[PDB]
Design a binder for this molecule. Sequence first.
Ligand SMILES: *[C@@H]1O[C@H](CO)[C@@H](O[C@@H]2O[C@H](CO)[C@@H](O[C@@H]3O[C@H](CO)[C@@H](O)[C@H](O[C@H]4O[C@H](CO)[C@@H](O)[C@H](O)[C@@H]4O)[C@@H]3O)[C@H](O)[C@H]2NC(C)=O)[C@H](O)[C@H]1NC(C)=O
Ligand SMILES: *[C@@H]1O[C@H](CO)[C@@H](O[C@@H]2O[C@H](CO)[C@@H](O[C@@H]3O[C@H](CO)[C@@H](O)[C@H](O[C@H]4O[C@H](CO)[C@@H](O)[C@H](O)[C@@H]4O)[C@@H]3O)[C@H](O)[C@H]2NC(C)=O)[C@H](O)[C@H]1NC(C)=O
Ligand SMILES: *[C@@H]1O[C@H](CO)[C@@H](O[C@@H]2O[C@H](CO)[C@@H](O)[C@H](O)[C@H]2NC(C)=O)[C@H](O)[C@H]1NC(C)=O
Ligand SMILES: *[C@@H]1O[C@H](CO)[C@@H](O[C@@H]2O[C@H](CO)[C@@H](O)[C@H](O)[C@H]2NC(C)=O)[C@H](O)[C@H]1NC(C)=O
Ligand SMILES: *[C@@H]1O[C@H](CO)[C@@H](O[C@@H]2O[C@H](CO)[C@@H](O)[C@H](O)[C@H]2NC(C)=O)[C@H](O)[C@H]1NC(C)=O
Ligand SMILES: *[C@@H]1O[C@H](CO)[C@@H](O[C@@H]2O[C@H](CO)[C@@H](O)[C@H](O)[C@H]2NC(C)=O)[C@H](O)[C@H]1NC(C)=O
Ligand SMILES: *[C@@H]1O[C@H](CO)[C@@H](O)[C@H](O)[C@H]1NC(C)=O
Ligand SMILES: *[C@@H]1O[C@H](CO)[C@@H](O)[C@H](O)[C@H]1NC(C)=O
Ligand SMILES: *[C@@H]1O[C@H](CO)[C@@H](O)[C@H](O)[C@H]1NC(C)=O
Ligand SMILES: *[C@@H]1O[C@H](CO)[C@@H](O)[C@H](O)[C@H]1NC(C)=O
Ligand SMILES: *[C@@H]1O[C@H](CO)[C@@H](O)[C@H](O)[C@H]1NC(C)=O
Ligand SMILES: *[C@@H]1O[C@H](CO)[C@@H](O)[C@H](O)[C@H]1NC(C)=O
Ligand SMILES: N[C@@H](CCC(=O)O)C(=O)O
Ligand SMILES: N[C@@H](CCC(=O)O)C(=O)O
Ligand SMILES: [Ca+2]
Ligand SMILES: [Ca+2]
Ligand SMILES: [Cl-]
Ligand SMILES: [Cl-]
Ligand SMILES: [Zn+2]
Ligand SMILES: [Zn+2]
Ligand SMILES: [Zn+2]
Ligand SMILES: [Zn+2]
Lengths: 679, 679
Amino acid sequence: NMKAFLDELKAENIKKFLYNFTQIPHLAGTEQNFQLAKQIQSQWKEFGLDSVELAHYDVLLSYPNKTHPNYISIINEDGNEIFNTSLFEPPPPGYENVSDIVPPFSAFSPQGMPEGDLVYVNYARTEDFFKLERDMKINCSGKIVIARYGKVFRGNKVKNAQLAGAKGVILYSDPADYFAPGVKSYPDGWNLPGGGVQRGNILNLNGAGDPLTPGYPANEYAYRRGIAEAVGLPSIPVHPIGYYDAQKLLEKMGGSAPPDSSWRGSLKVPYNVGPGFQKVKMHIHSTNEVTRIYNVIGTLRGAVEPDRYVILGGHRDSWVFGGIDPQSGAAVVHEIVRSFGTLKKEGWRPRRTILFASWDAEEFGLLGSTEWAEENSRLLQERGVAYINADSSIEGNYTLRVDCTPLMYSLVHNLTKELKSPDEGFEGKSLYESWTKKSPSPEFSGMPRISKLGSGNDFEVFFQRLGIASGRARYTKNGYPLYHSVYETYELVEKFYDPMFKYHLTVAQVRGGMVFELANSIVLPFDCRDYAVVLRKYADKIYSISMKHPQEMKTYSVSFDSLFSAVKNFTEIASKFSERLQDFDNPIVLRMMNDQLMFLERAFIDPLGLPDRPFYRHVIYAPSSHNKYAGESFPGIYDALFDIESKVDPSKAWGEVKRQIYVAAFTVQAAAETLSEVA
Amino acid sequence: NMKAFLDELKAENIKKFLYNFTQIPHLAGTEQNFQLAKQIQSQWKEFGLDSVELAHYDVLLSYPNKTHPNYISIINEDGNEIFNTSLFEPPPPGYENVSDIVPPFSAFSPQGMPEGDLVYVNYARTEDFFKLERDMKINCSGKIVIARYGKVFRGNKVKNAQLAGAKGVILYSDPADYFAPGVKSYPDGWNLPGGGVQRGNILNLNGAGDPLTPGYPANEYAYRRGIAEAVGLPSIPVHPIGYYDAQKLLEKMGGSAPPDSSWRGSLKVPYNVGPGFQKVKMHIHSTNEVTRIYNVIGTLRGAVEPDRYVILGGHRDSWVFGGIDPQSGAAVVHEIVRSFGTLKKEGWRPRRTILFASWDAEEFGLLGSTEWAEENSRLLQERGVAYINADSSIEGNYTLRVDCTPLMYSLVHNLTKELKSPDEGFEGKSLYESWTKKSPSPEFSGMPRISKLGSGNDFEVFFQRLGIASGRARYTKNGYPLYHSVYETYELVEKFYDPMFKYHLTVAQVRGGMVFELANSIVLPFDCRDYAVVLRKYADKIYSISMKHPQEMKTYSVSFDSLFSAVKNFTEIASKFSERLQDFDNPIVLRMMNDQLMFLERAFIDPLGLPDRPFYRHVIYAPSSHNKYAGESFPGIYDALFDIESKVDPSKAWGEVKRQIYVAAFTVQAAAETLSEVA
Ligand SMILES: *[C@@H]1O[C@H](CO)[C@@H](O[C@@H]2O[C@H](CO)[C@@H](O[C@@H]3O[C@H](CO)[C@@H](O)[C@H](O[C@H]4O[C@H](CO)[C@@H](O)[C@H](O)[C@@H]4O)[C@@H]3O)[C@H](O)[C@H]2NC(C)=O)[C@H](O)[C@H]1NC(C)=O
Ligand SMILES: *[C@@H]1O[C@H](CO)[C@@H](O[C@@H]2O[C@H](CO)[C@@H](O[C@@H]3O[C@H](CO)[C@@H](O)[C@H](O[C@H]4O[C@H](CO)[C@@H](O)[C@H](O)[C@@H]4O)[C@@H]3O)[C@H](O)[C@H]2NC(C)=O)[C@H](O)[C@H]1NC(C)=O
Ligand SMILES: *[C@@H]1O[C@H](CO)[C@@H](O[C@@H]2O[C@H](CO)[C@@H](O)[C@H](O)[C@H]2NC(C)=O)[C@H](O)[C@H]1NC(C)=O
Ligand SMILES: *[C@@H]1O[C@H](CO)[C@@H](O[C@@H]2O[C@H](CO)[C@@H](O)[C@H](O)[C@H]2NC(C)=O)[C@H](O)[C@H]1NC(C)=O
Ligand SMILES: *[C@@H]1O[C@H](CO)[C@@H](O[C@@H]2O[C@H](CO)[C@@H](O)[C@H](O)[C@H]2NC(C)=O)[C@H](O)[C@H]1NC(C)=O
Ligand SMILES: *[C@@H]1O[C@H](CO)[C@@H](O[C@@H]2O[C@H](CO)[C@@H](O)[C@H](O)[C@H]2NC(C)=O)[C@H](O)[C@H]1NC(C)=O
Ligand SMILES: *[C@@H]1O[C@H](CO)[C@@H](O)[C@H](O)[C@H]1NC(C)=O
Ligand SMILES: *[C@@H]1O[C@H](CO)[C@@H](O)[C@H](O)[C@H]1NC(C)=O
Ligand SMILES: *[C@@H]1O[C@H](CO)[C@@H](O)[C@H](O)[C@H]1NC(C)=O
Ligand SMILES: *[C@@H]1O[C@H](CO)[C@@H](O)[C@H](O)[C@H]1NC(C)=O
Ligand SMILES: *[C@@H]1O[C@H](CO)[C@@H](O)[C@H](O)[C@H]1NC(C)=O
Ligand SMILES: *[C@@H]1O[C@H](CO)[C@@H](O)[C@H](O)[C@H]1NC(C)=O
Ligand SMILES: N[C@@H](CCC(=O)O)C(=O)O
Ligand SMILES: N[C@@H](CCC(=O)O)C(=O)O
Ligand SMILES: [Ca+2]
Ligand SMILES: [Ca+2]
Ligand SMILES: [Cl-]
Ligand SMILES: [Cl-]
Ligand SMILES: [Zn+2]
Ligand SMILES: [Zn+2]
Ligand SMILES: [Zn+2]
Ligand SMILES: [Zn+2]
């Protein structure tokens, strides 16, 4: 049973694995990450899984030219390079003989050497550019943005800069965002040093996966698009830097003052917006190449319903050592596997099949999970019960953070009531109790906050494309300063985040317990009434956004009646379905009603996808078009409404709002009807 | 059991229903067809079904203007109308007081009054236009085609004419195609009189359904496209005529002689190609309007697997009386229903649920079946076992004609061995025996011909869009002369086609028996090895077509290795799966293996659809792009190869051939892998 599963999980084992996974870098496409794949595969076999395979793909990756390094310069009137940005981050104590630390770079930047005047765009959010071009009338065409990291996924910043006419982008970490007050830089605390730099990709893939093979797995015979028809590439060069290098570029900034204090970081600088101050010159030399990646897929066959899959997955590739991101998730998955395999060795099997995955190339655009899911989509869509992600277990040590589909709200509520809080001041009390005192829902009542799933991690294809119920759980802060830098080490974790490994252990219990229950409970632990509740809230919300335009709603006859009508029927049919679920015995009726619960998330998929994003097919949730990390509810209506006052042809824009209301109402009705009696 | 089902079916009942369904016209969108819907619904209730509902939709239909009739004219130098074509067909004996016989028209023609010179294009097939523009260098721009009916779906002719620059199309029935030697015109035989005219729509919908709501059901709150963004409308006027009116238009034809004898009909005319001879003028005045249609859906709940649906469906709407098309199919469905409901009344239930449908508006583009399937797609795709169509039971009286997915080849083989042939000279012998002596397969061996499913009938959405295994069966000739004319009456059927109603009865046994077996057999009666066999044949075929371009295949490295490799694995995995299907007991393993058989057809669906035809998603079969009625195998590769010697950029054209090989190979592999062990 479950308690046996949970008691077998040990903090010491997690620590031991984390140490083992973080001694060398494990960058996607390198031999070191292949070797770790082979190790994971051996150990998952010894741990007891029925099978463990490597699935490999040849996908577009991106690396810096080892002999022609990337950097940024200030240049004078005569073209001499008076300031050069660092070529590498200062390696942390004791790691100075590690080879193959990839220098800071923006994966997938095109090559180029643009010169021009700087403009400072704050976080390069959609609204930051709105402030620039609309209020301040500053024009970014032919300019070079600098933008600080924070708030939104860096791909969105680059996209916004492109559309504003920019010819390059420089990203940097501002200490207002990445330097927490009163704690020391690494190695003496967990803050970002001025030489530290955040790596990461800058693609705008919108669920496509490998940019060369959208729709189809990048296997041995795959037909690849030419690089110019590739999906999601930036067309301007991009490079990130630390805040020491950034102070040098920002201190000379002229032109307009910052519009208000929310544009000002905490470097001792004016934070003028520009343009200009001498010029800035980018040197970027990174190549794209097709490179083999390896997913490890472990199978633990179910005893009764082996054709029903519960998937626990997270990535293995890291930018550098991956002490938090991802090896603190991976070390948790490893111990979960060990523990399931221990039960299995004593003759136990879960009722449903469990798949365990170590994904590759997540850092480069979720490529490993996506290619695999493109290869196995027919299996996943007819047999896929649930996907639980397993990236970083900790990004802080304050409380639990859970993002999931409404179908798992009750499962998570119940599970955390049975678990001991690891928090200081809640010993004896339940994880539910600490989590809900520390992070209460705004949306009602005596309950913990659970957020919407956006994207930016490996659950994306499973949820947004295929409609498999998904969740994720980790310990969070009240990203983190050392995110995607060389300073993310084992030492960072043991010394400053989780010395006892008890937050790790709690996350392993939450992740492992969700999976256990999904794989073993007789009736699937999904509550469809939870979907009914949030659908009303999302419909109230999208309605209020529309009601900011009362005249247009009158003129174009914009009714939401059909959506509220669908949400009411969903509520009603969902009640009747839960009554039936309580009142029945009989392996056919059980299978039928489980298939209804399993397919309910599936019912929200529209095979035509959302407008211009064919691979985002969930009608209720999609990643925000302005921030891949954030989920948006009723995304088709929300985007049809966004900035609608600026459109040229209002009747066409409002026509499209109404079309999206119709699609959402139809889809909510049709979802509901999957829970009606079947005949 | 089955024999009980079959013995309850009576020829007299079929005759009785046919008579009842053919006394007045039942045109889609008229009150008469609504009344027949209500009648069907009452009777299916009295016959015993658990429920019977009307599902209605508001769809774009097309009617002639009652006060401004459509016609064609010859006009002289001064614009006087010297010949006018008939306004109506001479009504048959005894029906001259029937009101609301819709005059001949081409449903969905736009309005217009074009004048110009005639050009004669034979059947207006793709190759006919190739002969015109390529060999004979005749140019159809600003001209008016006339084309005879035959060979290909009339929508394709209109499309071909449009792309050739034509400004109007006149369709007519040539006696070489619609006047069988040695039999008399109606009412004294079954031939087309010179005043008879073939109605029918001329849309190019490619699976879209209602032209205003592609993707989504045309329900009460549907957002409709404007008519100018509508799907599949012709942009030139079209009108059909009989061969008396056609002789008048053809006799004066000048310009080039016909290129050979296959362009010559059997009117005593030269069959000159034109252009010119005086001019031709079209008067077309038909409107498009949104009109309510009604499907009747009957449910017979399954006793064990009520969440698994076997669907028997056919249309109810007719152009006029619908004596063959469709009421001879509908009268068969009615008796099948009666007969199932009789068993039900004696306490029996089928194992799986059976749905019975009387579709509306099939004649206008398969709109009734498609809208319903767009509304219920989530149900159909997770629960849909099979669809059997039930249009015209007879189009002749020579032998059986069966088109179906390979998955039903063995079911149909077995079923027809248990049925008595109704043929003259095969009394005592089996339907299998007559069918295979009369119509032997070219493709191998001692077996009857079974054709590929194309489209042009209500199975389209179920098979080509949703991937539900489908079939159809009817008696055929060695279309038929009176197709879609006023002369298609009950009398036509009783006097000349099937006086005893024994061909009807045989078709009711074949249709009803297929459904019985699908709904009641413990293991689904699908043989996946049958798919393996035809996949090799289709891959040999597509390969041979490519090998007509050996140089290009060398230059661009066009390999089919991946496809043959996928077909071999499918063959192998399909053998192993059938071994397992024989060797097992246990309601879970049974359900699992049935789900594997049910989803196998589903596995061939590509959610991105075929290029430019998003609603044709089956990778193995699609309607021919040159003839909606004909199925084409590996349609994505075949269309990438079609007329490839004429493309401007050969490396791009051959690039697209290879991409399609990759899609087909991936899809065959992925389909196969759904039949592998599940964990
Ligand atoms: C939520 O669930 C309910 C089911 O309880 C469902 O209600 C349906 O609403 C539609 C109207 O929106 C109803 O449509 C009617 O159907 C009848 C036949 O039974 C027609 O005669 C009616 O048509 C006339 O009136 C229209 C409206 O003014 C006219 O425009 C039209 O031209 C006709 O004159 C009418 O269309 C439907 O019957 C009910 N079903 C019920 C009550 O069982 C509702 O739609 C669901 N919500 C969503 C978004 O799906
Ligand atoms: C039909 O079924 C069979 C399964 O029985 C399946 O065979 C697979 O074929 C591919 C090759 O097309 C194999 O790929 C290999 O994988 C190994 C790892 O196990 C690699 O080391 C190999 O890579 C090297 O060689 C390549 C080819 O020259 C190089 O291009 C590459 O860069 C490497 O140097 C190789 O890729 C795969 O392992 C087998 N699986 C087996 C035999 O189990 C076949 O693909 C199926 N057909 C289709 C269309 O799916
Ligand atoms: C991580 O742990 C594994 C196994 O516990 C270590 O890999 C083993 O290393 C020993 C000594 O070289 C060998 O006997 C085995 O062949 C290895 N097992 C494998 C690959 O499965 C691995 O060295 C540890 N990594 C580090 C850096 O400490
Ligand atoms: C979470 O736990 C609650 C309380 O145990 C569960 O709700 C009860 O479930 C039982 C078992 O079916 C019902 O008889 C009770 O009537 C339910 N009570 C309440 C308060 O609703 C709930 O089902 C659990 N959720 C899961 C496991 O998904
Ligand atoms: C077709 O058959 C049906 C029923 O067998 C006939 O409809 C019935 O007509 C009688 C006499 O008018 C009434 O008592 C019933 O109300 C009708 N039943 C219905 C609508 O279900 C129908 O008239 C026949 N049609 C023709 C043209 O013969
Ligand atoms: C059609 O009938 C043939 C002959 O009865 C069936 O094939 C046999 O099926 C039985 C029952 O499972 C097997 O034990 C035999 O070995 C099969 N024999 C042959 C010649 O293959 C076939 O399964 C039937 N097809 C259906 C009902 O789909
Ligand atoms: C790295 O830089 C130099 C200069 O262009 C050259 O040797 C080599 O082509 C580069 N490597 C690449 C493009 O991968
Ligand atoms: C920047 O680097 C370039 C190329 O190596 C060099 O010419 C220049 O001197 C450098 N500038 C400084 C200040 O070091
Ligand atoms: C973890 O522990 C303490 C407890 O509040 C906290 O103050 C400290 O900042 C935390 N560590 C990190 C890295 O957030
Ligand atoms: C039928 O024709 C006449 C002339 O245009 C007119 O009375 C009426 O508008 C027409 N009906 C239509 C367009 O439905
Ligand atoms: C054709 O019909 C028109 C309109 O009714 C009329 O003016 C003309 O006379 C007709 N031609 C003949 C030959 O009847
Ligand atoms: C039906 O019966 C006879 C038998 O051969 C045939 O000659 C006749 O042409 C058939 N009827 C039709 C309409 O095809
Ligand atoms: N999690 C990685 C990848 C995100 C993505 O490519 O969507 C990041 O946030 O950088
Ligand atoms: N069966 C009808 C309709 C075909 C279609 O619209 O596809 C015909 O052939 O006219
Ligand atoms: Ca891909
Ligand atoms: Ca529609
Ligand atoms: Cl996660
Ligand atoms: Cl048919
Ligand atoms: Zn990560
Ligand atoms: Zn990361
Ligand atoms: Zn028909
Ligand atoms: Zn027809």
